[PDB]
Amino acid sequence: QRTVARDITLLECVGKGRYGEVWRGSWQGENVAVKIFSSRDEKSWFRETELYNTVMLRHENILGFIASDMTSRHSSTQLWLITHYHEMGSLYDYLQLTTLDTVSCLRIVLSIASGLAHLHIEIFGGKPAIAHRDLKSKNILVKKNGQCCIADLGLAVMHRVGTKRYMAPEVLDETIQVDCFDSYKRVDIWAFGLVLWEVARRMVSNGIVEDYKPPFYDVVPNDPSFEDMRKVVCVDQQRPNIPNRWFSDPTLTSLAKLMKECWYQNPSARLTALRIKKTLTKID
Ligand SMILES: COc1cc(-c2cncc(-c3ccc(C4CCN(C)CC4)cc3)c2C)cc(OC)c1OC
Ligand SMILES: COc1cc(-c2cncc(-c3ccc(C4CCN(C)CC4)cc3)c2C)cc(OC)c1OC
Ligand SMILES: COc1cc(-c2cncc(-c3ccc(C4CCN(C)CC4)cc3)c2C)cc(OC)c1OC
């Protein structure tokens, strides 16, 4: 009655980590990305699979779902997540050697805000509200059209811990209002402001650009502890540096203001993803 072609050819490993591996694969001539989960990270496969079984997200700035596969092996289960493949790789990867102009910088950050607002918003008749809980430049992919997409819903919550470098102050000091879904949106907004800072640094103005650095590179170790982050973010209340050269450029002046309004200690003071979108559409 019909053939169900399930063979995927795994062509090259494009990522290896505590999570397992990501491969470029081929299905029926077409590139796909295949995340093979470590035993360490099986719950991330279950969480993302449960979310996609609840709501089939479809948005240009969310990494496109194709399949969740569980295959029985002699003595183990193998768990694969299959998505669209973005050959340019992660934003983290891309910013290491690429500099940006005003148009490309804004297109990148507005695309991320668009994806994030789509996750956060409840739609009736639709989708539940979703918080990501691990937003960072390695969890954002660059598309050939200059927009990005948000990846990895293995920690997402619908209405493993986040990456410590990107944790909001209320996560580090354990004051987060865990029974208020809005709390999780506000944690994502903090992380978004860090991502905005990482991107803005790579935008050229008046022949000047900063080298790629991760958030807090100048105040925590290469592999920071939870306590390292708490002392910087909560006790001393440090924030990422805004270079003087940004204040000669109208785009970077507006982006500095925006990232400041993602980093308030008081989570309820931070901008919403929808407000960030509106602000970004009025820059330049
Ligand atoms: C099981 O596993 C995998 C399957 C596939 C795949 C391969 N060919 C065809 C299909 C297909 C889609 C949809 C229907 C519909 C037709 C309409 N009718 C109302 C009910 C059924 C039938 C068949 C699929 C889903 C790809 C895979 O990987 C890319 C799979 O592995 C993860
Ligand atoms: C998982 O992913 C991919 C799947 C497929 C694919 C293969 N066979 C059949 C289908 C299909 C056909 C028909 C229906 C519907 C149509 C209307 N109504 C009557 C209900 C049934 C659904 C599904 C698809 C979608 C192709 C893909 O790429 C070209 C996929 O992406 C990698
Ligand atoms: C963050 O998370 C996930 C990401 C992906 C994913 C999707 N498209 C493409 C990629 C990719 C391709 C190529 C490179 C390299 C190749 C070497 N070159 C020198 C630089 C570029 C990097 C990255 C990935 C990693 C899939 C996922 O799941 C299936 C992810 O997990 C949710």
mmCIF file of C-alpha atoms and ligand atoms in Angstrom:
data_model
loop_
_atom_site.group_PDB
_atom_site.id
_atom_site.type_symbol
_atom_site.label_atom_id
_atom_site.label_comp_id
_atom_site.label_asym_id
_atom_site.label_seq_id
_atom_site.Cartn_x
_atom_site.Cartn_y
_atom_site.Cartn_z
ATOM 1 C CA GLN A 1 0.000 0.000 0.000
ATOM 2 C CA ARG A 2 3.028 2.354 0.598
ATOM 3 C CA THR A 3 6.789 2.504 1.377
ATOM 4 C CA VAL A 4 7.751 4.626 4.419
ATOM 5 C CA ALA A 5 11.371 5.687 3.750
ATOM 6 C CA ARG A 6 12.955 6.198 7.186
ATOM 7 C CA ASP A 7 16.628 5.694 6.210
ATOM 8 C CA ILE A 8 18.675 8.837 7.051
ATOM 9 C CA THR A 9 22.307 8.946 5.830
ATOM 10 C CA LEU A 10 24.545 10.527 8.522
ATOM 11 C CA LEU A 11 27.180 12.457 6.529
ATOM 12 C CA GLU A 12 29.231 14.533 9.016
ATOM 13 C CA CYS A 13 29.248 15.355 12.695
ATOM 14 C CA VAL A 14 28.673 19.120 13.115
ATOM 15 C CA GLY A 15 28.460 19.053 16.945
ATOM 16 C CA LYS A 16 29.536 16.891 19.915
ATOM 17 C CA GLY A 17 28.897 17.690 23.603
ATOM 18 C CA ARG A 18 27.403 16.471 26.909
ATOM 19 C CA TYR A 19 24.012 16.447 25.000
ATOM 20 C CA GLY A 20 25.312 13.816 22.490
ATOM 21 C CA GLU A 21 26.013 14.682 18.835
ATOM 22 C CA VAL A 22 24.444 16.599 15.920
ATOM 23 C CA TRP A 23 24.915 15.262 12.367
ATOM 24 C CA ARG A 24 24.208 16.657 8.947
ATOM 25 C CA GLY A 25 22.082 13.937 7.370
ATOM 26 C CA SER A 26 20.345 13.296 4.100
ATOM 27 C CA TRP A 27 16.731 12.127 3.707
ATOM 28 C CA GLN A 28 15.367 11.700 0.123
ATOM 29 C CA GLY A 29 18.107 14.017 -1.245
ATOM 30 C CA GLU A 30 17.370 16.789 1.374
ATOM 31 C CA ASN A 31 19.639 17.980 4.207
ATOM 32 C CA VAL A 32 18.322 17.351 7.723
ATOM 33 C CA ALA A 33 19.969 17.837 11.113
ATOM 34 C CA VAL A 34 19.947 14.774 13.431
ATOM 35 C CA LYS A 35 20.540 15.239 17.180
ATOM 36 C CA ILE A 36 21.514 11.892 18.752
ATOM 37 C CA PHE A 37 20.944 12.161 22.541
ATOM 38 C CA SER A 38 23.400 11.032 25.200
ATOM 39 C CA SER A 39 21.967 8.903 28.055
ATOM 40 C CA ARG A 40 22.819 12.036 30.163
ATOM 41 C CA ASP A 41 20.288 14.144 28.204
ATOM 42 C CA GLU A 42 17.388 11.687 27.434
ATOM 43 C CA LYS A 43 14.919 13.884 29.352
ATOM 44 C CA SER A 44 15.577 16.756 26.859
ATOM 45 C CA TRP A 45 14.321 14.450 24.020
ATOM 46 C CA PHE A 46 11.202 13.554 26.057
ATOM 47 C CA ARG A 47 10.457 17.211 26.915
ATOM 48 C CA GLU A 48 10.843 18.506 23.363
ATOM 49 C CA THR A 49 8.879 15.530 21.971
ATOM 50 C CA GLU A 50 6.062 16.110 24.518
ATOM 51 C CA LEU A 51 5.919 19.827 23.537
ATOM 52 C CA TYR A 52 5.759 19.084 19.772
ATOM 53 C CA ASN A 53 3.109 16.389 20.450
ATOM 54 C CA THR A 54 1.090 19.148 22.221
ATOM 55 C CA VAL A 55 1.657 21.968 19.667
ATOM 56 C CA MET A 56 3.260 21.675 16.235
ATOM 57 C CA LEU A 57 5.159 24.980 16.294
ATOM 58 C CA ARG A 58 5.717 26.441 12.823
ATOM 59 C CA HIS A 59 7.520 29.785 12.656
ATOM 60 C CA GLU A 60 10.347 31.138 10.460
ATOM 61 C CA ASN A 61 12.422 31.980 13.576
ATOM 62 C CA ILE A 62 11.961 28.599 15.366
ATOM 63 C CA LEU A 63 14.093 25.651 14.205
ATOM 64 C CA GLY A 64 11.791 23.523 12.058
ATOM 65 C CA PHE A 65 10.711 20.195 13.516
ATOM 66 C CA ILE A 66 10.727 17.122 11.267
ATOM 67 C CA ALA A 67 10.655 14.078 13.562
ATOM 68 C CA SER A 68 11.258 12.477 16.975
ATOM 69 C CA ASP A 69 12.539 8.885 16.627
ATOM 70 C CA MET A 70 13.022 6.221 19.320
ATOM 71 C CA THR A 71 14.676 2.959 18.089
ATOM 72 C CA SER A 72 15.149 -0.194 20.211
ATOM 73 C CA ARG A 73 18.802 -1.478 20.351
ATOM 74 C CA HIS A 74 20.073 -4.823 21.834
ATOM 75 C CA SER A 75 20.812 -3.249 25.282
ATOM 76 C CA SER A 76 19.732 0.462 24.819
ATOM 77 C CA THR A 77 17.161 2.924 23.376
ATOM 78 C CA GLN A 78 18.478 5.401 20.715
ATOM 79 C CA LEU A 79 16.750 8.815 20.661
ATOM 80 C CA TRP A 80 17.009 11.126 17.630
ATOM 81 C CA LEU A 81 15.502 14.583 17.019
ATOM 82 C CA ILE A 82 15.390 15.490 13.315
ATOM 83 C CA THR A 83 15.074 19.143 12.245
ATOM 84 C CA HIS A 84 15.805 21.396 9.312
ATOM 85 C CA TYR A 85 19.560 21.888 8.634
ATOM 86 C CA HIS A 86 21.133 25.384 8.636
ATOM 87 C CA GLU A 87 24.531 25.077 6.924
ATOM 88 C CA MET A 88 25.779 28.450 8.326
ATOM 89 C CA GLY A 89 25.621 26.943 11.858
ATOM 90 C CA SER A 90 25.033 28.707 15.153
ATOM 91 C CA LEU A 91 25.093 32.435 15.848
ATOM 92 C CA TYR A 92 27.946 31.739 18.285
ATOM 93 C CA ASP A 93 29.914 30.110 15.406
ATOM 94 C CA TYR A 94 28.993 32.862 12.914
ATOM 95 C CA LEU A 95 29.991 35.817 15.149
ATOM 96 C CA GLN A 96 33.551 34.398 15.714
ATOM 97 C CA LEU A 97 34.812 35.548 12.261
ATOM 98 C CA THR A 98 31.907 37.589 10.744
ATOM 99 C CA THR A 99 31.392 41.309 11.358
ATOM 100 C CA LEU A 100 27.996 42.958 10.775
ATOM 101 C CA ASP A 101 26.616 46.180 9.339
ATOM 102 C CA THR A 102 23.534 48.013 10.663
ATOM 103 C CA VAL A 103 21.093 46.142 8.381
ATOM 104 C CA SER A 104 22.476 42.632 9.163
ATOM 105 C CA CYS A 105 22.739 43.347 12.915
ATOM 106 C CA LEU A 106 19.117 44.532 13.132
ATOM 107 C CA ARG A 107 17.866 41.654 10.917
ATOM 108 C CA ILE A 108 19.576 39.110 13.256
ATOM 109 C CA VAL A 109 18.265 40.623 16.498
ATOM 110 C CA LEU A 110 14.698 41.346 15.267
ATOM 111 C CA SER A 111 14.480 37.724 13.945
ATOM 112 C CA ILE A 112 15.492 36.396 17.387
ATOM 113 C CA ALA A 113 12.959 38.709 19.152
ATOM 114 C CA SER A 114 10.312 37.500 16.656
ATOM 115 C CA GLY A 115 11.022 33.828 17.445
ATOM 116 C CA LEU A 116 11.055 34.531 21.178
ATOM 117 C CA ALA A 117 7.804 36.538 21.163
ATOM 118 C CA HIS A 118 6.192 33.661 19.221
ATOM 119 C CA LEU A 119 7.281 31.189 21.934
ATOM 120 C CA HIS A 120 6.115 33.473 24.764
ATOM 121 C CA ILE A 121 2.616 34.382 23.442
ATOM 122 C CA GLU A 122 -0.455 32.231 24.162
ATOM 123 C CA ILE A 123 -2.722 31.980 21.034
ATOM 124 C CA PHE A 124 -6.378 30.862 21.583
ATOM 125 C CA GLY A 125 -8.362 28.510 19.257
ATOM 126 C CA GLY A 126 -3.372 28.340 18.616
ATOM 127 C CA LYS A 127 -0.595 27.447 21.141
ATOM 128 C CA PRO A 128 0.263 27.533 24.853
ATOM 129 C CA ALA A 129 2.713 30.170 26.065
ATOM 130 C CA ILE A 130 6.285 28.658 26.068
ATOM 131 C CA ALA A 131 9.440 29.769 27.895
ATOM 132 C CA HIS A 132 12.753 28.473 26.406
ATOM 133 C CA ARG A 133 14.905 28.396 29.585
ATOM 134 C CA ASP A 134 18.279 28.043 27.781
ATOM 135 C CA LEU A 135 18.448 30.973 25.318
ATOM 136 C CA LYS A 136 22.030 31.706 24.204
ATOM 137 C CA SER A 137 24.025 32.232 20.995
ATOM 138 C CA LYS A 138 24.820 28.462 20.623
ATOM 139 C CA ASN A 139 20.995 27.793 20.638
ATOM 140 C CA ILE A 140 20.398 30.206 17.699
ATOM 141 C CA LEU A 141 21.049 29.175 14.072
ATOM 142 C CA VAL A 142 21.821 31.530 11.151
ATOM 143 C CA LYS A 143 19.786 31.117 7.935
ATOM 144 C CA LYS A 144 20.996 32.040 4.440
ATOM 145 C CA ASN A 145 18.368 34.859 4.221
ATOM 146 C CA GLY A 146 20.069 36.669 7.143
ATOM 147 C CA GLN A 147 17.403 35.830 9.763
ATOM 148 C CA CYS A 148 18.042 33.443 12.655
ATOM 149 C CA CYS A 149 15.985 30.694 14.295
ATOM 150 C CA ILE A 150 15.842 29.629 17.935
ATOM 151 C CA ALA A 151 16.759 25.982 18.653
ATOM 152 C CA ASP A 152 16.656 23.432 21.527
ATOM 153 C CA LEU A 153 13.337 23.202 23.388
ATOM 154 C CA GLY A 154 14.682 20.427 25.608
ATOM 155 C CA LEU A 155 14.272 22.607 28.726
ATOM 156 C CA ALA A 156 11.162 24.534 27.533
ATOM 157 C CA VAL A 157 8.055 24.931 29.758
ATOM 158 C CA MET A 158 4.451 25.313 28.522
ATOM 159 C CA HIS A 159 1.624 27.334 30.198
ATOM 160 C CA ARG A 160 19.217 19.859 33.292
ATOM 161 C CA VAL A 161 19.284 23.607 34.316
ATOM 162 C CA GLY A 162 19.957 26.664 32.079
ATOM 163 C CA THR A 163 23.536 27.565 30.989
ATOM 164 C CA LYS A 164 25.008 29.269 34.073
ATOM 165 C CA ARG A 165 26.703 32.149 32.156
ATOM 166 C CA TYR A 166 23.242 33.243 30.905
ATOM 167 C CA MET A 167 21.254 32.773 34.180
ATOM 168 C CA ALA A 168 19.215 35.751 35.431
ATOM 169 C CA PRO A 169 19.845 37.120 38.922
ATOM 170 C CA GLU A 170 16.612 35.573 40.333
ATOM 171 C CA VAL A 171 17.802 32.099 39.175
ATOM 172 C CA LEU A 172 21.258 32.609 40.767
ATOM 173 C CA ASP A 173 19.833 33.970 44.116
ATOM 174 C CA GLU A 174 16.891 31.450 44.076
ATOM 175 C CA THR A 175 14.274 34.267 44.448
ATOM 176 C CA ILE A 176 12.571 33.337 41.141
ATOM 177 C CA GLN A 177 8.719 33.175 41.593
ATOM 178 C CA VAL A 178 8.539 29.504 40.321
ATOM 179 C CA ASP A 179 4.653 29.442 40.504
ATOM 180 C CA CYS A 180 4.351 32.468 38.094
ATOM 181 C CA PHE A 181 4.790 31.459 34.443
ATOM 182 C CA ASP A 182 5.765 35.117 33.679
ATOM 183 C CA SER A 183 8.902 34.438 35.809
ATOM 184 C CA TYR A 184 10.218 32.114 33.071
ATOM 185 C CA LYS A 185 9.549 34.640 30.294
ATOM 186 C CA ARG A 186 11.524 37.235 32.290
ATOM 187 C CA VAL A 187 14.498 34.812 32.614
ATOM 188 C CA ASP A 188 14.485 34.424 28.810
ATOM 189 C CA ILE A 189 14.451 38.241 28.388
ATOM 190 C CA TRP A 190 17.615 38.545 30.526
ATOM 191 C CA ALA A 191 19.347 35.939 28.311
ATOM 192 C CA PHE A 192 18.098 37.751 25.178
ATOM 193 C CA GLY A 193 19.741 40.945 26.387
ATOM 194 C CA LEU A 194 23.071 39.053 26.725
ATOM 195 C CA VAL A 195 22.660 37.703 23.163
ATOM 196 C CA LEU A 196 21.914 41.237 21.936
ATOM 197 C CA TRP A 197 25.208 42.408 23.550
ATOM 198 C CA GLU A 198 27.136 39.544 21.875
ATOM 199 C CA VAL A 199 25.768 40.515 18.430
ATOM 200 C CA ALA A 200 26.046 44.323 18.845
ATOM 201 C CA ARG A 201 29.778 44.001 19.650
ATOM 202 C CA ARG A 202 30.308 42.577 16.125
ATOM 203 C CA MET A 203 28.497 45.478 14.368
ATOM 204 C CA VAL A 204 31.068 47.844 12.710
ATOM 205 C CA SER A 205 30.761 51.630 13.361
ATOM 206 C CA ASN A 206 33.280 54.283 12.314
ATOM 207 C CA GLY A 207 35.736 51.459 11.343
ATOM 208 C CA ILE A 208 35.613 49.983 14.899
ATOM 209 C CA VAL A 209 34.381 46.558 16.040
ATOM 210 C CA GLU A 210 34.839 44.482 19.207
ATOM 211 C CA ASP A 211 36.191 40.923 19.051
ATOM 212 C CA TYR A 212 33.667 38.153 19.787
ATOM 213 C CA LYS A 213 33.465 37.474 23.519
ATOM 214 C CA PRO A 214 30.885 35.615 25.567
ATOM 215 C CA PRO A 215 28.908 37.502 28.238
ATOM 216 C CA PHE A 216 30.937 38.211 31.411
ATOM 217 C CA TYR A 217 34.216 37.029 29.768
ATOM 218 C CA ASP A 218 36.114 39.698 31.742
ATOM 219 C CA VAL A 219 34.732 38.845 35.233
ATOM 220 C CA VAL A 220 34.213 35.028 35.459
ATOM 221 C CA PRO A 221 36.390 32.025 34.571
ATOM 222 C CA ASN A 222 36.316 30.206 31.241
ATOM 223 C CA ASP A 223 33.948 27.651 32.838
ATOM 224 C CA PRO A 224 32.163 29.612 35.551
ATOM 225 C CA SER A 225 30.615 28.077 38.646
ATOM 226 C CA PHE A 226 27.091 28.884 39.840
ATOM 227 C CA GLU A 227 28.708 30.854 42.714
ATOM 228 C CA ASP A 228 31.043 32.747 40.322
ATOM 229 C CA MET A 229 27.942 33.922 38.449
ATOM 230 C CA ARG A 230 25.924 34.722 41.590
ATOM 231 C CA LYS A 231 28.697 36.977 42.987
ATOM 232 C CA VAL A 232 28.979 38.962 39.709
ATOM 233 C CA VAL A 233 25.286 39.214 38.805
ATOM 234 C CA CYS A 234 23.575 39.306 42.236
ATOM 235 C CA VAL A 235 26.099 40.517 44.842
ATOM 236 C CA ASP A 236 28.084 43.080 42.817
ATOM 237 C CA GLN A 237 25.217 43.630 40.285
ATOM 238 C CA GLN A 238 27.662 43.831 37.322
ATOM 239 C CA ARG A 239 26.386 44.027 33.756
ATOM 240 C CA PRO A 240 28.191 43.679 30.431
ATOM 241 C CA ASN A 241 30.358 46.660 29.371
ATOM 242 C CA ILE A 242 28.980 49.106 26.757
ATOM 243 C CA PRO A 243 31.979 50.537 24.824
ATOM 244 C CA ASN A 244 32.156 54.311 24.303
ATOM 245 C CA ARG A 245 32.297 53.843 20.492
ATOM 246 C CA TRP A 246 28.657 52.614 20.532
ATOM 247 C CA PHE A 247 27.457 56.139 21.598
ATOM 248 C CA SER A 248 28.712 57.651 18.259
ATOM 249 C CA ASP A 249 26.386 55.257 16.336
ATOM 250 C CA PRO A 250 22.584 55.739 16.498
ATOM 251 C CA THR A 251 21.841 51.995 16.062
ATOM 252 C CA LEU A 252 24.253 50.890 18.805
ATOM 253 C CA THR A 253 23.037 53.740 21.095
ATOM 254 C CA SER A 254 19.446 52.393 20.707
ATOM 255 C CA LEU A 255 20.606 48.740 21.175
ATOM 256 C CA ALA A 256 22.532 49.695 24.397
ATOM 257 C CA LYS A 257 19.295 51.186 25.801
ATOM 258 C CA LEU A 258 17.369 48.059 24.827
ATOM 259 C CA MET A 259 19.813 45.619 26.428
ATOM 260 C CA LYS A 260 19.840 47.739 29.656
ATOM 261 C CA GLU A 261 16.010 47.271 29.804
ATOM 262 C CA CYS A 262 16.471 43.467 29.570
ATOM 263 C CA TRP A 263 18.913 43.474 32.568
ATOM 264 C CA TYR A 264 16.975 45.118 35.399
ATOM 265 C CA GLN A 265 17.470 43.241 38.719
ATOM 266 C CA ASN A 266 13.645 43.457 39.209
ATOM 267 C CA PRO A 267 12.312 40.892 36.700
ATOM 268 C CA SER A 268 8.936 42.709 36.381
ATOM 269 C CA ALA A 269 10.801 45.885 35.167
ATOM 270 C CA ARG A 270 12.266 44.110 32.092
ATOM 271 C CA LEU A 271 10.773 44.694 28.614
ATOM 272 C CA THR A 272 8.526 42.003 27.113
ATOM 273 C CA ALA A 273 9.554 40.291 23.846
ATOM 274 C CA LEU A 274 6.667 42.079 22.080
ATOM 275 C CA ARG A 275 7.900 45.486 23.337
ATOM 276 C CA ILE A 276 11.483 44.622 22.193
ATOM 277 C CA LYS A 277 10.074 43.846 18.692
ATOM 278 C CA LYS A 278 8.299 47.193 18.505
ATOM 279 C CA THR A 279 11.454 49.068 19.672
ATOM 280 C CA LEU A 280 13.601 47.251 17.084
ATOM 281 C CA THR A 281 11.181 48.052 14.203
ATOM 282 C CA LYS A 282 11.630 51.829 15.014
ATOM 283 C CA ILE A 283 15.497 51.771 14.975
ATOM 284 C CA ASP A 284 16.973 53.066 11.643
HETATM 285 C C1 LIG B 1 7.835 6.450 10.819
HETATM 286 O O1 LIG B 1 9.092 7.143 10.752
HETATM 287 C C2 LIG B 1 9.344 8.045 9.722
HETATM 288 C C3 LIG B 1 8.438 8.289 8.679
HETATM 289 C C4 LIG B 1 8.794 9.269 7.687
HETATM 290 C C5 LIG B 1 7.787 9.302 6.609
HETATM 291 C C6 LIG B 1 8.296 8.753 5.426
HETATM 292 N N1 LIG B 1 7.502 8.638 4.336
HETATM 293 C C7 LIG B 1 6.212 8.965 4.426
HETATM 294 C C8 LIG B 1 5.602 9.421 5.611
HETATM 295 C C9 LIG B 1 4.188 9.669 5.663
HETATM 296 C C10 LIG B 1 3.638 10.835 6.098
HETATM 297 C C11 LIG B 1 2.249 10.967 6.190
HETATM 298 C C12 LIG B 1 1.398 9.941 5.843
HETATM 299 C C13 LIG B 1 -0.075 10.204 5.969
HETATM 300 C C14 LIG B 1 -0.775 10.248 4.650
HETATM 301 C C15 LIG B 1 -2.188 10.746 4.952
HETATM 302 N N2 LIG B 1 -2.994 9.846 5.792
HETATM 303 C C16 LIG B 1 -4.170 10.627 6.263
HETATM 304 C C17 LIG B 1 -2.278 9.313 6.981
HETATM 305 C C18 LIG B 1 -0.746 9.153 6.826
HETATM 306 C C19 LIG B 1 1.948 8.761 5.405
HETATM 307 C C20 LIG B 1 3.327 8.616 5.326
HETATM 308 C C21 LIG B 1 6.445 9.587 6.746
HETATM 309 C C22 LIG B 1 5.945 10.203 8.025
HETATM 310 C C23 LIG B 1 10.035 9.953 7.681
HETATM 311 C C24 LIG B 1 10.907 9.666 8.707
HETATM 312 O O2 LIG B 1 12.114 10.350 8.802
HETATM 313 C C25 LIG B 1 12.326 11.540 7.989
HETATM 314 C C26 LIG B 1 10.555 8.757 9.714
HETATM 315 O O3 LIG B 1 11.430 8.493 10.737
HETATM 316 C C27 LIG B 1 11.624 9.480 11.766
HETATM 317 C C1 LIG B 2 8.197 14.238 8.241
HETATM 318 O O1 LIG B 2 8.830 15.062 7.255
HETATM 319 C C2 LIG B 2 8.452 14.965 5.921
HETATM 320 C C3 LIG B 2 7.372 14.272 5.499
HETATM 321 C C4 LIG B 2 7.025 14.249 4.135
HETATM 322 C C5 LIG B 2 5.832 13.466 3.703
HETATM 323 C C6 LIG B 2 5.967 12.256 3.026
HETATM 324 N N1 LIG B 2 4.879 11.599 2.629
HETATM 325 C C7 LIG B 2 3.705 12.070 2.851
HETATM 326 C C8 LIG B 2 3.429 13.239 3.524
HETATM 327 C C9 LIG B 2 2.040 13.642 3.725
HETATM 328 C C10 LIG B 2 1.074 13.564 2.702
HETATM 329 C C11 LIG B 2 -0.198 13.938 2.950
HETATM 330 C C12 LIG B 2 -0.657 14.382 4.217
HETATM 331 C C13 LIG B 2 -2.025 14.846 4.502
HETATM 332 C C14 LIG B 2 -2.604 15.685 3.361
HETATM 333 C C15 LIG B 2 -4.067 16.126 3.527
HETATM 334 N N2 LIG B 2 -4.940 15.161 4.223
HETATM 335 C C16 LIG B 2 -5.552 14.171 3.315
HETATM 336 C C17 LIG B 2 -4.242 14.455 5.316
HETATM 337 C C18 LIG B 2 -2.984 13.745 4.833
HETATM 338 C C19 LIG B 2 0.287 14.467 5.253
HETATM 339 C C20 LIG B 2 1.589 14.090 5.003
HETATM 340 C C21 LIG B 2 4.561 13.976 3.887
HETATM 341 C C22 LIG B 2 4.351 15.291 4.554
HETATM 342 C C23 LIG B 2 7.788 14.988 3.257
HETATM 343 C C24 LIG B 2 8.860 15.743 3.743
HETATM 344 O O2 LIG B 2 9.671 16.506 2.952
HETATM 345 C C25 LIG B 2 9.289 16.596 1.544
HETATM 346 C C26 LIG B 2 9.165 15.766 5.078
HETATM 347 O O3 LIG B 2 10.209 16.538 5.546
HETATM 348 C C27 LIG B 2 11.521 15.999 5.639
HETATM 349 C C1 LIG B 3 21.627 24.145 18.800
HETATM 350 O O1 LIG B 3 20.844 22.938 18.682
HETATM 351 C C2 LIG B 3 20.685 22.249 17.500
HETATM 352 C C3 LIG B 3 21.275 22.622 16.296
HETATM 353 C C4 LIG B 3 21.025 21.861 15.162
HETATM 354 C C5 LIG B 3 21.665 22.266 13.852
HETATM 355 C C6 LIG B 3 20.825 22.529 12.790
HETATM 356 N N1 LIG B 3 21.317 22.923 11.601
HETATM 357 C C7 LIG B 3 22.642 23.022 11.459
HETATM 358 C C8 LIG B 3 23.569 22.803 12.493
HETATM 359 C C9 LIG B 3 25.041 23.009 12.141
HETATM 360 C C10 LIG B 3 25.535 22.676 10.873
HETATM 361 C C11 LIG B 3 26.876 22.938 10.532
HETATM 362 C C12 LIG B 3 27.769 23.481 11.452
HETATM 363 C C13 LIG B 3 29.220 23.765 11.154
HETATM 364 C C14 LIG B 3 29.870 22.819 10.155
HETATM 365 C C15 LIG B 3 31.354 23.187 10.124
HETATM 366 N N2 LIG B 3 31.554 24.594 9.713
HETATM 367 C C16 LIG B 3 33.011 24.896 9.741
HETATM 368 C C17 LIG B 3 30.832 25.580 10.538
HETATM 369 C C18 LIG B 3 29.362 25.188 10.601
HETATM 370 C C19 LIG B 3 27.290 23.804 12.692
HETATM 371 C C20 LIG B 3 25.931 23.601 13.028
HETATM 372 C C21 LIG B 3 23.059 22.384 13.714
HETATM 373 C C22 LIG B 3 23.963 22.039 14.870
HETATM 374 C C23 LIG B 3 20.215 20.769 15.225
HETATM 375 C C24 LIG B 3 19.633 20.387 16.431
HETATM 376 O O2 LIG B 3 18.829 19.278 16.579
HETATM 377 C C25 LIG B 3 18.685 18.384 15.465
HETATM 378 C C26 LIG B 3 19.897 21.116 17.568
HETATM 379 O O3 LIG B 3 19.337 20.747 18.788
HETATM 380 C C27 LIG B 3 17.987 21.138 19.011
#
